[PDB]
Amino acid sequence: CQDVVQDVPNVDVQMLELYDRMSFKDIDGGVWKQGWNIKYDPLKYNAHHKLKVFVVPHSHNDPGWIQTFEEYYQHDTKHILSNALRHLHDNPEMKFIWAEISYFARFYHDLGENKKLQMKSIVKNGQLEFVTGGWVMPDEANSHWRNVLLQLTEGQTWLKQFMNVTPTASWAIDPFGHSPTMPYILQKSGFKNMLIQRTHYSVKKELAQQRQLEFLWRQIWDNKGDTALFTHMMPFYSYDIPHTCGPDPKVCCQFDFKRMGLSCPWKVPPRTISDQNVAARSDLLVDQWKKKAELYRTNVLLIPLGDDFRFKQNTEWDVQRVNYERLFEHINSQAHFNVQAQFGTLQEYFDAVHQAERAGQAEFPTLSGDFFTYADRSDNYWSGYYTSRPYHKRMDRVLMHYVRAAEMLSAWHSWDGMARIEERLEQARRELSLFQHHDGITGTAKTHVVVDYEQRMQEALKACQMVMQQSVYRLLTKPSIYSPDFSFSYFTLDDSRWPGEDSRTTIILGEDILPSKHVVMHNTLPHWREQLVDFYVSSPFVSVTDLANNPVEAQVSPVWSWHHDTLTTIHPQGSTTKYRIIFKARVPPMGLATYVLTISSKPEHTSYASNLLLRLPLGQYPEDVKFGDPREISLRVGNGPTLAFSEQGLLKSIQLTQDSPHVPVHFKFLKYGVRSHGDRSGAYLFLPNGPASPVELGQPVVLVTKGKLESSVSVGLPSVVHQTIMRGGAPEIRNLVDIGSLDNTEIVMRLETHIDSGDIFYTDLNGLQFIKRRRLDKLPLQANYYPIPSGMFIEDANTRLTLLTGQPLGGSSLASGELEIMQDRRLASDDERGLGQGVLDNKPVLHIYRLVLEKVNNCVRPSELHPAGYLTSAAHKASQSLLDPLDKFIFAENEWIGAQGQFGGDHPSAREDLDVSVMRRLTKSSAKTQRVGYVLHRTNLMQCGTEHTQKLDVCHLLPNVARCERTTLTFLQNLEHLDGMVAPEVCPMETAAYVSSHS
Ligand SMILES: [Zn+2]
Missing domain, CATH: 3.20.110.10 (Glycoside hydrolase 38, N terminal domain)
Incomplete structure (x- = not known):
């Protein structure tokens, strides 16, 4: 290699x-x-x-x-x-x-x-x-x-x-x-x-x-x-x-x-x-x-x-x-x-x-x-479309993940043609495929066309859920019981992040309406993963067990929502009939893990978050809401970082460890305009009239929730509900963005550090590679904006800051020590590139991010002259948590005879730089030889000199391998017959494809 x-x-x-x-x-x-x-x-x-x-x-x-x-x-x-x-x-x-x-x-x-x-x-x-x-x-x-x-x-x-x-x-x-x-x-x-x-x-x-x-x-x-x-x-x-x-x-x-x-x-x-x-x-x-x-x-x-x-x-x-x-x-x-x-x-x-x-x-x-x-x-630089119609840009990522999970889940078995798996998968791939068009994901299509794209993706998401639920029931029901109705909903999907949406099932538990509920977690990645998961529950008195009935530590938090009193002000309201149960799901590589939610008073192994409102009844909820004047705030979950926030509930500094410095890291919202004279910004073009100016935040309501598993700081800003979530590592940032009215405005989110980055920054290309960028003062501002499809970073001799995204957006580093990423844009003018409209159709999108501050002085970096940069293990995993989180399934019925507790506990747990990007069965049931295709990508991570792994051989994943071929990425040509039927090791920054035949 x-x-x-x-x-x-x-x-x-x-x-x-x-x-x-x-x-x-x-x-x-x-x-x-x-x-x-x-x-x-x-x-x-x-x-x-x-x-x-x-x-x-x-x-x-x-x-x-x-x-x-x-x-x-x-x-x-x-x-x-x-x-x-x-x-x-x-x-x-x-x-x-x-x-x-x-x-x-x-x-x-x-x-x-x-x-x-x-x-x-x-x-x-x-x-x-x-x-x-x-x-x-x-x-x-x-x-x-x-x-x-x-x-x-x-x-x-x-x-x-x-x-x-x-x-x-x-x-x-x-x-x-x-x-x-x-x-x-x-x-x-x-x-x-x-x-x-x-x-x-x-x-x-x-x-x-x-x-x-x-x-x-x-x-x-x-x-x-x-x-x-x-x-x-x-x-x-x-x-x-x-x-x-x-x-x-x-x-x-x-x-x-x-x-x-x-x-x-x-x-x-x-x-x-x-x-x-x-x-x-x-x-x-x-x-x-x-x-x-x-x-x-x-x-x-x-x-x-x-x-x-x-x-x-x-x-x-x-x-x-x-x-x-x-x-x-x-x-x-x-x-x-x-x-x-x-x-x-x-x-x-x-x-x-x-x-x-x-x-x-x-x-x-x-x-x-x-x-x-x-x-x-x-000076007509086309950095606009890195951001236009951000709701669909985010929808792309969600759909991407659901097709992966649907194809992997159903790949394990051959399906009778009445289940209609091949059809649903085919539709889902095609819909997602069409949105790759240079007028789809780009946000440069007419409103009714964007409408068409959205309806198609929606049907594609429904098709993935139907395949995923059927697959999960098959994978975890005892074969001696398994007797499917292919049109039945065995499980409903639970997604905390799409659409973000007043949907989500509350699980209704009662001491005899319904005492217990089975939930399953799917892990599409090929290593063991532990991840906090959450469900909505009708009572705060819930405890968590595995199928073996071992206790699992949980936390309960209230469900909060934000309202614009319109009269007044943007304030949170708390539910009196639904609560969030949170616990750590441990899930095998490419595998499934079953847990049980049981109702009881306050359980042994479930704690209650506190709530502090800085400027509210909560049902059967143990800890009463506290109230406070606007103040600075510091939280730590687990041994993970300590974070300090402004009195406006915006991140101000991070401390990595108990004995390391308080590292300044300020979040700021700014706004860019459109031109006086000159060309007008449109779906394609970004034509700012000067540097962005700060948004006036007033004195907003800051909600603080503090728990042993998870804590967070949320604030109702004009246009944006902004949240920082803490689980023990790199925090997660959510922005609910409603640009609503504000015509000829682009909303930017900027980070400000003392990192001595100078003119250097790093943005990724298609979620595959990070490329070095140099800010050029000889070029206009719009020319220093680049695609941010999954992440960006700045660094010096000592310190890196990396922002990972759940969605493609535009971004830059317009001064030493800064990172910045556009949130939304609303535009009264066409930019005369054929479209006829500006961008006047925005809708609320939930943007998700991870924020990684790291010490890099003991990392093997590329020389000054190398045009590439490379993520750390932490930043890579944080990206993986954004694009391929755990899938959540709620059993839809009251009893699940046959129920098993885990699938894939025997699957090899491969080195962290390796992903099985595609698992896809390639043959219908009617073929004598079953065939499965695998795409493998190995990334390259910085060696910071910072764990137990097994060799993964995709050719042997499924039983009774008769043939294995290294293939082109589309699976359409053989490039090497593998005599062993064992897949060779893949090199850093390579992608390879294998097709395994089974008898
Ligand atoms: Zn075209």
Whole structure:
């Protein structure tokens, strides 16, 4: 295994280093506004050295933006695919590429056998070629890596199953910024090349000037270059026809034969190609081509030909095809051009490029880093969408976890087809897959479309719960009893965090209404976990036992809610009929643990929290509420940190241990505005008019709850209920955010330390890796905002502070010792990127965080020059507690004969840096050989020199292994037959996939 800490890779282009030297000057380049006047030597080209041009027709199809998936399908996409099918069929030299498998699957299932076979025909002959082959073309900023891999697996599985094809070239023309997570997943899924579009205009200029637009893109820690993927970055402002033929959009636009009810902004129309003009039109176009080719190292040129929802009408197919045919026939017949031009596919382009390299005509540069934050022009940085529609951003994470848990839970058994497991899982994967779209998780879609996304995710959550409950009943009922009704609710799910919602079951216990209640906890992670869990109960006199009837220590706290008296003030109210029972659930790796809640007066092993209101009846509750003037507060749970809070109930300092210092750590809410003159912030753009200013907090009500297992500080701020929860380690932060009214406002949460971070900070990419960022004072504020998909940190010689998130949001470190993360944004103006609206549809979201202060001076850190950072064990586990908590199940009935106490107590408890990211059964009951796929990710944690673990071999997890294969990440190809049927060890920062066959 490579060393990802000691050794700094050598690459031609390192993006952090690149950004440091770049001036980012927005100069007028001329007809190429953001470049220069391309010159080529016309004697470069002769009969020995021709330009080879691939004109690649395409149609960008959004699975939701202005319209819903179904709306666009009905209006646009179904017509495009019928025409493609007809036109390619009748025109054997015509070519077409296709990205979005969601729409292809939808269309293909509606075809008659005949059309099905004809369609297979034009795929087999290579005329219609699938690119990437994902369900969608996903967002790359906010998306979790697991979800990127999910949407990819979904489209490619569909392709392999229905078309017997697996794309090896990727096409990503539209995401707003590009992540190295994409080459990382794609190269582990058999890909050979990929294409990107949306990078900062100033980065395109810099690279274009050195012919570094094609590059071998490797991971920032990769010393060897094993991860490298060949990447083509297109050079110009857009993927549309004006911006794809060459440098001068005024010329290129004349070669979009659909604009003769569409027209050319530059006021020069296209003209039909005839014998009259062909020489002149050809000359104009090839000049364009040769200008573009000068930016690349080979004599092979990629010319994309299309636009959004293009190739819809029969006559668009003719006008495009026939005019370009006339051009090609003329160009290729005339030796003075020294050009071979034709219709081609993406993979055809890449093949010819690799032919040129293998012949030694070019050596390509190496690149590591990322392409965030993107700007299309002047100071219009697209950091807005790191935050837009934050409720759905959080919904993504919750759904992500429920599909994982549903697929793992049900993977253990084969299910009769009447249970409908395969169907529910299929729906849940597809819904979650669709939201990966660059108008889904991004928050850049119209309100009714966001509505559609939400309803779909909701149905997907319901489908996971139905699978999870059925699986749990099967796993913990004695086989001699197990007799299921697949439409029965054996368990209801209990979620303390989604939606946060006046739902949640109260368990109603009574000395003879119902005395005891069985609850089960599921642990999706492959090691033993202990975690505080909570349930709502109808009495404060409840005690906890395991199934063996051993006592478990518990605490009871009141249920509190916050009201806006509107008359007055934001105040808490306490329940008189529901209480919270809290205890530590111990749960096996990938396993289940049953507990019992029994009613009794005050039990032996249950304590009662106290309540202090700083500025209230509580039912059958033992400790009466106390009252107080606003004051500073210090709490400690267990031996864990001691935390001091302001008189406004905001964290002020943390003390790690009894004898360590009181470390200043201040939370502050601030607000950013929109511009006086200038451009207006929208769904995409963040255009603050100066540094944020502090929110006026007044004198708010601070609620303090103090218990032996769990304590917390909650405060009703204007817009935000803010809570710090203490369980013994790193606290959890919850914000209930209601931006409600406050137009042209962005609400930020900032941390202020004395940590001597300077200009350095660290943000993660897709929850997979942490990348070094440098704050740049030469760039505007919005350009120092980066995606925070799961966490961020600052550090000095001695001290780290890391914030872990349950939800993708935007964030920065805008001064030494600070971290900051946007909570919500409300926006009266459109930012003119196509959407037509601002963001005027906000709703209450519960944001969750963990807050880790640590001493790092005895940690093995990477050198000053390494572009990556690495989490500690504590910060890694805190992240895992946010994204993959314990699942909670309440038995829905009164008696559970058969009940067992635990599942998975024999499962190996693997090293903490290792996760079984996916467990998914791959075969229905009707197959003779059962097969299960596993995705394994091993992260890399700092060695701080800070435990008993067993070897985990996924091939042996289930009984009667007959075969085990190391596979691509999508499970679709074998990469190594494992003679042993034992899975090899995986390296730090690697992801591997195994498929186990069972007899
Ligand atoms: Zn798009």
